[PDB]
Design a protein around this ligand. Structure first.
Ligand code: ADP
Ligand code: ADP
Ligand code: ADP
Lengths: 38, 362, 449, 443, 441, 66, 132
């Protein structure tokens, strides 16, 4: 299943944590924090 | 013995022994209620008496699978007013032909000769003049003007957008070198710049943080947010309405009693607005920007007086069923699955509902 | 279960002919007053009369309140019995004549048939549809919701008014919930999740509930008991709509308001429609104003007009006072503490002191009511009080004497346990002697004047 | 119905010859009080005539002498044509507003603005409704309506289709539509379509189809008081305070504007002004501040006639420490003419008891009526009138079809009159709590 | 701290015979009154009988409050004991009658039982999904015992709690599923090192054992007043604490009375009736007394205890006097206890207890002199001199309070009677009842 | 800057056979009128207008109470 | 606390399938008057930064009991970036970049009364109307 266009996902475990960003939000303002703005 | 629900109905119907004879018909319903009161009258989701008009559905068979549910709810109390009063200038604030005062008076009293308009304020902004302080209150002439013309609800919506930046300064500009710095245009907001509430939220030992939440914690810890409601209003009604035979009244009813801006503020941003804001190339501040409707204090009853019958209530509503529940749990631990025989066939259905609640097996 | 001053009173104890049995239903004596209270019960059960006044007149401790509570039991649960003291009338929120009117209309009941017209189902689809408004500044608005409801007998798709979607939204409904929608009010209830997908691993502590059996659209009928005052309060503080006034009116603090005659009159029209529609039975009841001497000349002068109303309950006053000053009218003295204007309106049931053998009977009724098994010499002892001391002092000794007897290991109260109760627990008169003798002069150990 | 039998239910009017103002010895439920009924009829005439503003009349006389009855007779003989406000003087001591504000609102309630307006109303049985709802809604639809005399079809505009769907209008429904507002009231279900109403329970009523044209102009004659216009203009739902109360003190400049506008509507001929009555029951419960306000409120052009009743002799005026007749200050009594009610003769008591025995469903034997008359002389009209109900209830306990002397004797024995009640008090003074608080509970 | 009654720890009676000991549990003397209060105390515990009004009467001091405080200690925490000063009733937010109704209903407990369910486990993983620009949130919790792992879906309310608690993998947490509250118990992993600002490392814990879910029966006691407040309202239940509650309508109470009876028949609730103690009861008005007298008559009325110092004294709100300042038809419903002024050996024993409670080492002669002062100045004054003499003794570094310190305290601080003479000796220089005064030498 | 919708013009009265609409004749005088009105206010009117939002500025006043 | 010298994502070693972007750390530089630090933060701070609209040259603090951040304002080192900008600037924090201090709070019990009986920070319409 392809992930939701606008739910950014945080996951934390023994390895620490990560944030994963939908391909639809890269190139939006919400991508700017991740180095992937417009 | 009989549960109080059984006992009440049984007593009211056995009282008919004094009135009539029919004895067989009565003693049949004795056996009914003494088995379970839901055989006699099913407990079902219920609400206060509605003292209002609504549109009844006249037929189910004619209705079809797609139906429009209009909001039909209206008051039976019904205030007939002529349009001469309600529309054609008997309302002094409503400008139009006839009401020639209202249009002049609105402009001059709210703008021209109104002290809060920026041009008037700007003439009073120095020395001993009545707006001298406005340099040191953090509002601009525009915000002061707005706050003097918008009502308490609209002003409270505007507060929802703002950042308590003077509270953050209390965390940062601490030290003698910081001189407890404050922006000079906020100089008079002393109690915002110096307030334990901000510090108590940042310290890691939450001692004063907890001392400030005592009331809300213990309220919740007492379970009062989850305990069943012990009362509700016996009657409920919608607001009384003007009835006027004009179209302006119908528009103005919708503008006030179903006020779009208040409703939008309470219920928050619309889903397409959330989509536009999240997919936009640059950030945009939504309105309002969040749902300003509070959380309900009762975490289960929320904002309505509708009760749903509990299965625990159903169990205890029959004295036999309440007594049988202990015996069946004993019999379960005795190694027996449920096996019972009934003089009334409909009681088998209630036991299937009971067993599908309990998840014990036949 | 708990035992109180009147737990032994069960009724008026009359014959079918309306004569009083000298000891019945917990009473001893007052027979003429119990017979007069019977004819008042007949006046109430025969709905035909409005605004008749009864005064229970008699000294303190003569069973005036026992008579009023006995009336409340002869009328049974169906008829509204509305008890107040005259000291409840002084509200800080609203004028005291408002509280009287609220109590007058609380004493008139209505039993009314109501049809609730509702939709029930598992939400299987929920799809909002919206418009870009012209620039009102609040932005886009939901124009309608499309919602799919599934019951056991198939399913239906509802295109909701957005006013009802606000009910759905404030109820935090989701797809896969079971909901109840009430088309009377536009109100919504989330009943639960479906029992479908009822997996255990939710932190949400969901109540999974079965799919509604039957048709997805239902039209159940139920019978509601309400007072006229319940309608007044509903229409004065509206809360059953989904409009903004009804919505905010649930967030504001509740406060009483001086409901106008205009509202009350127009609710008479509404209720008379229910009568003519055959959906309501009007069941007028009784207002018991205990301690009616604590009313004032404005209360009494209002009651004149209130009783002349074309509908009003029966009012039963009780007073225990002789010729006394009318409150708020220090110029005026009258019997019972009731204005001479108002006393003319009432039927007075005078109430008389008990004889010593009646006190003995009451003591025995009261003892066995409390479960105090009591010897006959002990009964005679307790009944020497009530003659020499108030009757109430007798009845109050029974519980200490029971405790003392059982602490002494006795199964039953002897004269000894009362004679100890008499010593630990004084009457007012013996205590009044202690005051006058100890406070015979001032000092460090004196009572304060 | 919801009106029960009450103390004044027998009063149907003033009982006066309208051609001459001669009081008939009895009619319309009033007995005797002829001179007082004549004077109240002269007041009634000048109330209806409207030309005279702000006169106060006091009705003065002993208790139970027909003062309220004459007030009720005037209200019954004015009817809906004139505003009639009844005020117990206890009512103005509000916690929401000062008593002069409450007393202003009472004067404002007693002047009517009569406004005459028309609308086209369309009424008939729905033959069918088609609405396409073409996802989307309210796109297009046709309505057929019939009376017994006509049938017509209409294309509906989209905001009318919303109204029809909002009211769940169905084939067979008898509806009225006000055209300019577009509200739909379902007057009922047509009997011929009864079979279609499968969801309606058997308790449902049905109606015959309407008659005449589908559309006609119906004129409505509203009367709205000055107080209602005042309250409407107070706030955005000002009228909502006409029900709940919670009007404040309405600002004087709002009232002054409204008076000017109502003078405009009168001069423009758009509205009539209809002066009513304010009846102040037991006016002596007012205090000296109230009477000072009333004195000049009566001098307003938009003042009703004020009618007042007092039981009181020379008595202490409230809010001061001196005495005056009726308990009313002489400066106020200078502005007031007075009607006196006298005590009743035994035959008038007999007639009032007979009338009261007609209004209650009671048969009195002639000797029971004679005994109640004798009791009425000795114990007062009100007490004997309360023995009527008591005697019927006792008679019904013995299953008697007529009330006999035995039933009246049981009533007299069971229920004390005021005098025997006082005598009982004057004997029981040690058992009753005295004005000193002293009481003896011993036997 | 040490307060006026902190030494009172019970009623000091034999639980079997109700015989008062001459001194125990910090009470001394008053044996007749302490036995009477012990009979009342037992009929409080028995619950069977409603609406008994007991008046404790006596001169000032003589322990009437001390007796009432001894009763409260002997009931423990579970039974309600609503202390009320009669001057609290004169609210501006509600009538005296409503204020009394609330005070009665505060004194009846409803003891409600529920089965909670709780979780106890190590968090192995957390996933949270958040809608950009707010609104919806979603997530999954993976949580572990030595014996189970399971993945629980999380709603927004739980994700708020999880993030407010800053829950992380390796935390040990417990969740009350019924209330939704979370608490971190500790951590099983170390605190990591890859990130800064992770904050405090909580207690090390071994992983919880057994099943994740456990049922937990818990019991909560709430007043009838607390049920009233939340059932008269949709919103604003802080009125339980802020006191914002208005005059609650009687329809709500009538419903609640019916429902609490039904909850008792259902076995959902136990009613636990307690005490309303009205101190200074002579301060009520005639209107208050004519409410209590009939409020007592209800099945849910508490047992009412009162204290009065007053003699034959004026009733407030009326023109006339009565014993205790209480109306006679009120006192008709009252059984009266009389406390008696103490003897010198009773004074000595009380002052020894006060000295021991304040941890003051009196010399025997100082205790004798304080007893002599106690006889003539009063027990409260002689009590006040104990702490005062301790301080004076500390100035001179004395290891015990000597007679010199008590004399020094007696010198510095006047008793009431001596102050009354001081006033009489300076009537020219104090402000009179005429308002006249002379300021000159 | 005051303006009012007087109604719908009755030239559109047959745009449908039924609509929830109020149809009014076209204005029959000049489209423009100029008239001079001598307006009176008082200093108290200026107080009240400046003390608080008045009329349609304060809709939440419909709640009453506070 | 500091002026934000930098914000920079650390790309994760093991990106989540279907997302294409996966960050394992966000690095922030904070400068004070008394020094600056390279700060490695859990990527969840993205939520605070994006809501709070933190930018390089803004003055912020990070509180360790939440891991969230709050923005005081833009550093007055940038007050000349434009001829007009619609915010006031705030000075660079004159303390250390990292504060760990004991703090002693003067409180009365009456302060606890009012703080419990009328909570101050509530974000709903009735709270916010209440505080107006
Ligand atoms: N005739 C009677 N038979 C039995 N009990 C009585 C009788 N009269 C009074 N009592 C009881 O005596 C007590 C006092 O009576 P009460 O009604 O309080 O008198 P009052 O209301 O006039 O002061 C109550 O417990 C009441 O139930
Ligand atoms: N002349 C009369 N004709 C008919 N009924 C009367 C007459 N006078 C008094 N009554 C009735 O007797 C009762 C007492 O008279 P009322 O008018 O109330 O006297 P007041 O107002 O002076 O107390 C009322 O029920 C009234 O209707
Ligand atoms: N019997 C006693 N035993 C111990 N302390 C007592 C006793 N009587 C009084 N006291 C103490 O003396 C002081 C006065 O007694 P208190 O109960 O306040 O009298 P009052 O009846 O005036 O309230 C209090 O500090 C109280 O604790």
């Amino acid at each position: 299943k392809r992930p939701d266009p606008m739910m950014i996902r945080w996951v934390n475990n023994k390895m620490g944590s990560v944030v994963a960003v939908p391909e639809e939000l890269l190139g939006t303002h919400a991508g700017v924090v991740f180095g992937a703005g417009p | 013995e009989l549960s109080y629900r059984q006992r009440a109905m049984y007593q009211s119907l056995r009282n008919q022994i004094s009135i009539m004879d029919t004895l067989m018909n009565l003693v049949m319903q004795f056996r009914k209620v003494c088995n379970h009161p839901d055989l006699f009258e099913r407990a079902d989701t219920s609400s206060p008496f509605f003292c209002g008009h609504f549109a009844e559905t006249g037929s189910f068979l004619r209705e079809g699978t797609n139906v429009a549910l209009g909001y039909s709810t209206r008051s039976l109390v019904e205030y007939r007013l002529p349009r001469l009063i309600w529309c054609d200038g008997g309302r002094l604030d409503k400008p139009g032909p006839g009401n020639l005062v209202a249009g002049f008076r609105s402009k001059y009293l709210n703008h021209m000769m109104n002290i809060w308009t920026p041009e008037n304020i700007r003439s009073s902004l120095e020395g001993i003049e009545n707006f001298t302080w406005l340099r040191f209150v953090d509002t601009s002439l525009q915000e002061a003007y707005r706050a003097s013309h918008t009502d308490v609800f609209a002003r409270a919506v505007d507060l929802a957008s703002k950042q308590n930046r003077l509270g953050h300064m209390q965390i940062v500009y601490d030290e003698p070198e910081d001189k407890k710095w404050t922006p000079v245009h906020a100089l008079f907001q002393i109690c915002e710049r110096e307030n334990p509430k901000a510090v108590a939220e940042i310290t890691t030992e939450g001692v004063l943080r907890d001392l400030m939440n005592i009331a809300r914690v213990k309220y919740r810890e007492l379970g009062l947010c989850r305990l069943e409601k012990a009362a509700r209003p016996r009657a409920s009604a919608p607001p009384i309405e003007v009835v006027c035979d004009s179209r302006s009244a119908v528009i103005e009813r919708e503008n006030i009693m179903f006020h779009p801006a208040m409703r939008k503020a309470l219920f928050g941003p619309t889903p397409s607005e959330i989509k536009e804001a999240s997919f936009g190339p640059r950030p945009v501040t939504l309105y309002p920007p969040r749902a300003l409707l509070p959380a309900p204090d009762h975490d289960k009853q929320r904002f309505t007086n509708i009760t749903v019958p509990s299965m625990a209530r159903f169990v205890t509503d029959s004295g036999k069923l309440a007594k049988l529940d202990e015996l069946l749990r004993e019999l379960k631990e005795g190694g027996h699955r449920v096996l019972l025989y009934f003089q009334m066939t409909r009681m088998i259905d209630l036991m299937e509902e009971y067993l599908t609640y309990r998840n014990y097996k036949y | 279960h708990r035992t109180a001053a009147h737990t032994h009173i069960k009724g008026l104890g009359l014959n079918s002919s309306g004569i009083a049995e000298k000891q019945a239903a917990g009473f001893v004596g007052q027979c003429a007053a119990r017979e007069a209270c019977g004819v008042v019960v007949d006046l109430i059960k025969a709905h035909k009369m409005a605004g008749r006044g009864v005064l229970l007149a008699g000294g303190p401790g003569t069973g005036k309140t026992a008579l009023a509570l006995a009336i409340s039991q002869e009328l049974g649960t169906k008829i509204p019995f509305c008890p107040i003291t005259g000291s409840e009338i002084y509200s800080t929120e609203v004028k005291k004549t408002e509280v009287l009117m609220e109590n007058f209309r609380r004493a008139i009941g209505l039993r009314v048939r109501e049809t609730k017209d509702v939709y029930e189902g598992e939400v299987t689809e929920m799809t909002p549809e919206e418009a870009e408004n012209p620039l009102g500044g609040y932005g886009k608005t939901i124009s309608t919701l499309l919602i799919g409801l599934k019951s056991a007998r198939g399913q239906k798709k509802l295109r909701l008014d957005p006013s009802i979607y606000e009910a759905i939204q404030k109820e935090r409904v989701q797809v896969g919930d079971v909901i109840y929608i009430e088309t009377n009010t536009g109100a919504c209830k989330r009943v639960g999740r479906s029992d479908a997908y009822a997996t255990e691993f939710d932190l949400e502590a969901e109540e999974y509930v079965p799919i509604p059996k039957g048709e997805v659209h239902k039209k159940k009928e139920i019978v509601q008991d309400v007072t006229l005052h319940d309608l007044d309060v509903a229409n004065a503080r509206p809360q059953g709509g989904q409009d903004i006034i009804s919505m905010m009116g649930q967030l504001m603090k509740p406060k009483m308001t001086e409901i106008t005659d205009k509202l009350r009159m127009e609710i008479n029209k509404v209720v008379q429609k229910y009568i003519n529609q055959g959906v309501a039975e009007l069941i007028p009841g009784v207002l018991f104003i205990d301690e009616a001497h604590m009313l004032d000349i404005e209360c009494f002068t209002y009651l004149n007009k209130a009783l002349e109303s074309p509908i009003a309950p029966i009012v039963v006053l009780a007073s225990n006072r002789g010729i006394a000053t009318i409150r708020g009218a220090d110029d005026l003295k009258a019997a019972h503490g009731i204005p001479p204007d108002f006393l003319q309106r009432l039927l007075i049931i005078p109430t008389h002191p008990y004889e010593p053998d009646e006190i003995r009977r009451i003591v025995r009724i009261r003892a066995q009511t409390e479960g105090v098994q009591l010897t006959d010499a002990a009964v005679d002892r307790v009944a020497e009080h009530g003659v020499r001391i108030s009757l109430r002092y007798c009845l109050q000794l029974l519980a200490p004497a029971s405790i003392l007897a059982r602490v002494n290991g006795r199964t039953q109260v002897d004269v000894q346990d009362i004679a100890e109760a008499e010593e630990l627990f004084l009457d007012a008169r013996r205590s009044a002697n202690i005051l006058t003798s100890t406070g015979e002069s001032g000092g460090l150990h004196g009572f304060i004047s | 119905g919801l009106n029960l039998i009450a103390a004044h239910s027998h009063i149907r009017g003033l009982g006066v010859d309208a051609d001459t103002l001669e009081p008939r010895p009895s009619s319309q439920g009033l007995v005797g009080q002829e001179k007082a009924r004549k004077a109240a009829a002269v007041v009634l005439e000048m109330i209806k005539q409207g030309k005279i503003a702000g006169r106060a009349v006091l009705i003065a006389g002993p208790p139970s002498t027909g003062k309220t009855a004459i007030a009720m007779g005037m209200a019954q003989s004015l009817g809906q044509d004139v505003p009639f406000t009844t005020l117990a003087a206890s009512e103005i001591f509000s916690l929401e507003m000062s008593k002069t504000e409450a007393l202003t609102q009472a004067f404002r309630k007693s002047i009517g603005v009569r406004i005459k307006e028309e609308s086209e109303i369309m009424e008939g049985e729905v033959v069918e409704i088609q609405i396409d709802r073409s996802t989307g809604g309210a796109k297009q639809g046709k309505l057929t309506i019939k009376t017994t005399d006509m049938e017509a079809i209409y294309d509906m505009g989209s905001k009318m289709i919303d109204a029809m769907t909002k009211e769940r209008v169905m084939a067979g429904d008898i509806i009225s539509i006000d055209k300019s507002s577009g509200k739909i009231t379902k007057l009922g279900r047509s009997y011929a379509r009864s079979r279609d109403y499968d969801a309606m329970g058997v308790d449902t009523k049905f109606l015959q189809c309407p008659e005449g044209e589908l559309q006609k102009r119906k004129e409505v004659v509203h009367t709205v008081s000055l107080h209602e216009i005042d309250v409407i203009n107070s706030r955005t739902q000002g009228f909502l305070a006409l029900f709940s109360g919670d009007t404040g003190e309405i600002r004087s400049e709002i009232r002054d504007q409204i008076n000017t506008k109502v003078a405009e509507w009168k001069e423009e001929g758009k509205a009539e002004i209809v002066p009513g009555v304010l009846f102040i029951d037991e006016v002596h419960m007012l205090d000296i501040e109230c009477f000072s306000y009333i004195n000049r409120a009566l001098e307003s052009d938009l003042a009703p006639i004020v009618i007042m009743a007092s039981n009181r002799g020379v008595s202490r005026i409230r809010g001061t420490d001196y005495k005056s007749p009726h308990g009313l200050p002489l400066d106020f009594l200078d502005r007031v003419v007075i009607i006196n009610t006298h005590p009743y003769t035994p035959d008038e008591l007999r007639q009032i008891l007979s009338i009261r025995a007609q209004e209650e469903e009671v048969d009195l034997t002639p000797d029971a009526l004679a005994l109640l008359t004798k009791i009425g002389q000795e114990a007062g009209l009100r007490y004997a009138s309360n023995l009527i109900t008591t005697s019927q209830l006792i008679a019904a306990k013995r299953r008697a079809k007529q009330v006999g002397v035995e039933d009246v004797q049981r009533s007299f024995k069971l229920f004390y009159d005021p005098a025997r009640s006082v005598r009982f008090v004057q004997e029981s003074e040690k058992r009753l709590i005295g004005n000193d608080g002293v009481v003896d509970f011993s036997y």
